[PDB]
Amino acid sequence: DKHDLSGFVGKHLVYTYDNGWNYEIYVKNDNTIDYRIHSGLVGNRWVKDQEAYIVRVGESIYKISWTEPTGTDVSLIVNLGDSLFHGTIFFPRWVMNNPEPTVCFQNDHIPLMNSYREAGPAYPTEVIDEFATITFVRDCGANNESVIACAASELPKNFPDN
């Protein structure tokens, strides 16, 4: 059944892009995620309660897609059976130009982001398209507010320490 997000809702995942960029996702429910970026262009950025379109595309392969307040588009592939992760991120020109002003707990700064989104140049878009190694998987149940509750810099040095 393609409409059964059963095996994916509650998923907490750590994974490293072929470019070295390190990222972490928590699938909060059938339309919501939390995430926390640990390194790369926008390292330390993190985000609770991002509306996402979440679907099943294979027995155990799921897709998540969403749009940011910054103008960024994301579409991710998590293959749980084969342990394969694929991410495409379309960033606006100004994020590439100035990544450091997207770096924050976004929830405190959503009108700031909308501001940058209409000033710095939208275009041309940077497509960053990349495979990642899933470094950790876990299930944490639905609506769990405490999976992603601080910045990555606040975590043990270590993280994971499970």
Automatic annotation (TrEMBL):
Active site residues per record: 23 (proton donor), 68 (proton acceptor)
Spans traversing the lipid bilayer: none
GO terms assigned for molecular function: carboxy-lyase activity
Domain of life: Bacteria
Gene3D superfamilies in UniProt: 2.40.128.20
PANTHER family: PHENOLIC ACID DECARBOXYLASE PADC
Protein name, UniProt field: Ferulic acid decarboxylase
Biological source species: Enterobacter sp. Px6-4
Lineage of origin: Bacteria, Pseudomonadati, Pseudomonadota, Gammaproteobacteria, Enterobacterales
